[PDB]
A paper describes a structure:
[name] is a phospholipase anchored to membranes via two palmitoylated cysteines located in a hydrophobic membrane-interacting region (MIR). Tecovirimat is an inhibitor of mature virus wrapping widely used to treat mpox patients infected with clade IIb strains. Tecovirimat binding to [name] blocks viral wrapping, but the structural mechanism is poorly understood. We showed that [name] forms a homodimer on membranes, and tecovirimat inserts into a cavity formed between the two protomers.
We also assayed one escape mutant ([name]) identified in vitro but never reported in mpox patients. The mutations identified in the clinical MPXV strains were located at the homodimerization interface and were expected to have an impact on tecovirimat-induced dimer formation, whereas [name] was located further away. As controls, we generated three additional viruses bearing substitutions in [name] known to confer tecovirimat resistance: rVACVG277C, rVACV4MUT and rVACVA295E. As expected, all the control viruses could be rescued and grew to high titres.
Author numbering:
A (entry chain A), B (entry chain A): 6 to 372
Amino acid sequence: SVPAGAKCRLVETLPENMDFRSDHLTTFECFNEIITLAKKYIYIASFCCNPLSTTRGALIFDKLKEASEKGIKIIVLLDERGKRNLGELQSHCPDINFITVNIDKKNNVGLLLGCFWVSDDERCYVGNASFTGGSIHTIKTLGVYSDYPPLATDLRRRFDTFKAFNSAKNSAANLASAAAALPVSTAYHIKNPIGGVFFTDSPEHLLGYSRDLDTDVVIDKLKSAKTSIDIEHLAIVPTTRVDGNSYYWPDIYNSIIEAAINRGVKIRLLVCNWDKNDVYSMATARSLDALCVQNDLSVKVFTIQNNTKLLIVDDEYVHITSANFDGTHYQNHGFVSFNSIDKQLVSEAKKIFERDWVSSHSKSLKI
Amino acid sequence: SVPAGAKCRLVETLPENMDFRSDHLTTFECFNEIITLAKKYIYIASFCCNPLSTTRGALIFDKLKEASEKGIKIIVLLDERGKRNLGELQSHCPDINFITVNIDKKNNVGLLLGCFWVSDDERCYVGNASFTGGSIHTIKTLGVYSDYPPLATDLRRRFDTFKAFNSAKNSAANLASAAAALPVSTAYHIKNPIGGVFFTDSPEHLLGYSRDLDTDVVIDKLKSAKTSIDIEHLAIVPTTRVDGNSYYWPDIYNSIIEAAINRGVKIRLLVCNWDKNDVYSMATARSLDALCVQNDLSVKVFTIQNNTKLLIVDDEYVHITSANFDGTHYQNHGFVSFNSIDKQLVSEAKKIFERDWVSSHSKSLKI
């Protein structure tokens, strides 16, 4: 028999300067358990790699340094734009195999946002706590830990698809034939969960034929919302700025409004504050301001460093990821998202959203 | 051989209290020519029927009264919500067959917005000048007249589909079997124009299998815009209010923004002013205000009574109709739209839009 929830428990970073308190596992405690119980390998992936920026991040980097010196195969994947610290990371850990990743060499837009750990095909972490000292110590994060082998092995297959994109000779990033010979395998998806948990992937040109697009799954869960929509992300502005040109993409921005106006869904949004010089964020904020007074919608903002990417629908489906709901992320960026329908696991996630909604850092939307 | 433009020339209403001037045919001159040259029948359709509200409208109603007394079969289609004047219209013209129409008895939402004339299968008018004294004399309108038999006959087939929906015993409005036996025929569409002119229809449950949806054709022409988008409609607010509940529909609202931001299309919009008490119109206006300063977009408003529904794309495609770009109209309301790609006919339409854009009634968008 398979366990309910796939042995998943919540993991988050709650800095001391913030009022967030919980009994769940912490991100610092989570990374120590993965390195301690490691016997075969430790595979880590994130956008930027910089553990030495805080105290707790350096201790995790020392435990990973000691693990690499005992025979554990350590491979760290980072986007080629976090290449500044590469000379610093290799100088402190010569046994750790640092690999730069460029998943999109056709247009140089897709970034490696896969934020997850995996070890021995048994234990794994996934969330938005990137391999940075801030995301371990000073930046609020939110993730999930599970010691279930079948769930960690399916996340390891996500690592194999991302590892092939290396800026070194002929590979999945340089050849079109070596990239088509990639086994893009997934053991579980929205049509076959494991313990009520499944992974959604991104972008579309890296799904193959079996994996499900995270864009289609999130939109379907938002269009199928009946009672409540709770989102804690960076921003839900439908317009992003790639290079020096603005990009418009309101797919997520419309499926949420379709729930509040047409279906009367009680929606609560918790995004960051916005630049007053950004006309796309001011117009988006004033558009949401007229909806809170006309429908059952509520918006609060915060100014702290928080990478939390949370989505809860009808207290029945939860969605934790590292990418933000926008056009640039769900069209080009590569990442893996956590999807679960376990009522007990969603209830603990609803407990976290209610904590952050009434927190002192969450001031009401004022324009 | 077939003539270019299908013998089409512009027709509009330019009241004396307004500064609009042109050498084209007027709506009052257009209705006199149709009644004078009538030999077989005159079929008229609009939402509300009230010709006696102005001077020119009463003269058209007298010419139509004299035509009905000579043997011309006069059938007037009006929506069952314009039934107030029905006792007045029949009292002045007993020989004219007035018919109330309810195209949607399933939900009582679809309204008869078909605004067109047709006579002898030879001459026909189509636009937004409804059968009202205002739309002939005091309300600015815009339409097209053509004495081409094949184009008028295809518009008569639109009248046959609308006439079947009568609130009288068993018919297309009462029976589901008598409504399926309806010949829903079109001779020309977007895949087969006549002289560069074709009709698009609405709603979707009245198209059959041959007619093209006006919603799909307009969105495709907006998504295929390369240089310019010129629209003169009532309003492009993505939210409408059906009954006492708001309805959200941004399909047209998004395809236009996709052109200005992603494709850099120079777009000029001329809509009416909005109620300051309407939060959906204020948020929509402030959203457009931040786009005019960030992209090549310009918006002007007017307060006069104007039913003009115009759409020009890249000076190559023109779209004149009676319904407004919104959710309630293109989802439920029944109407026929004028579509033409004739360069000479679009050039005359571009001449009209430039006149209304710099007119004194078109004040710049101020918030």
